[PDB]
Amino acid sequence: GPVPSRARVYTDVNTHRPSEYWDYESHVVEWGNQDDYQLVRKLGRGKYSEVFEAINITNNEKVVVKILKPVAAAKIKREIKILENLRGGPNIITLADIVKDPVSRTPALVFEHVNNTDFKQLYQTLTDYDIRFYMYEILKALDYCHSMGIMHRDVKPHNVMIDHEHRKLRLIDWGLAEFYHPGQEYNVRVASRYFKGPELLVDYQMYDYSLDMWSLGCMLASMIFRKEPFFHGHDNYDQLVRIAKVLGTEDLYDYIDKYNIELDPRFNDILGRHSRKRWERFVHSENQHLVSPEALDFLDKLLRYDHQSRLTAREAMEHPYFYTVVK
Ligand SMILES: CCc1ccccc1-c1c(Cl)cc(CNCCc2nc3ccccc3[nH]2)cc1Cl
């Protein structure tokens, strides 16, 4: 069957830490007072929660309230334990309180408020320097959570809040996050389609922190090439075909052969034979201001089929792409 895999970094973090650190099912939730929070407006509804702008009337400060839907309400201890474990970490959203919503009868997580800059303005106007700056801030959050034995598993632009006036970034929505335990087989039905790593698309369950690095590469490629999303699959199968049209089929077969993975036979009629493309094929006069040899080299080291061959977050921080960033 499949060849086992383990991360090349941070394998032992959940062994070295006490059981109370990762055994989220044993965690006893300390409930706060729902009456301290006044809901102001609904910001959005996803498939697992409804999010609101609210005011903490005990200190008059703005907060964000995430009310979990009953479907996500089962694995709430996992999200709470992860958020408490990571609290105070660089660029990690701060969990301020946990209350019982009187209407839904479900847990409601209260977060610090971020004065978000409009998402379309950021995509359309961040400069080459700003993209490097914010990519470095995301790496700080990813290396921190990985070093803490946690994989986010849903890295995408919707889950990164930026307050551009204060050069402030937060990695949010830890609802799909999981503790990394070497040898554990995880659910491949994680991350949004355009950010899913090849390991998820070929149904390889023994993945690790490196899944986050593929997702980060998809964000970078979209941003620098002005191509939203970069890998535009119609469904999860066409998603791998879109990746293979760029990275090539030969390296895909080398990857599946290394791990003794067998592709779903439905790929026989859709995958084809594709050469690896040079990253310069995606450069044009409308994105040249965002591209550099360093950007392409960095992207090349994230977007690799072999999850064990991608840059780790800490190695990525010393890449030449970030030399221009004020540290
Ligand atoms: C295209 C991804 C990207 C690549 C390189 C550098 C920066 C970005 C980026 C952009 Cl342009 C915009 C955002 C802004 N995303 C906002 C998401 C958001 N805003 C919310 C407001 C309320 C509730 C949830 C929310 N989620 C984040 C990033 Cl990482």
Ligand SMILES: Cc1ccc(O)c(C(=O)O)c1
């Ligand atoms: C501050 C904030 C806003 C919206 C969200 O969905 C989250 C979260 O899920 O952690 C956090």
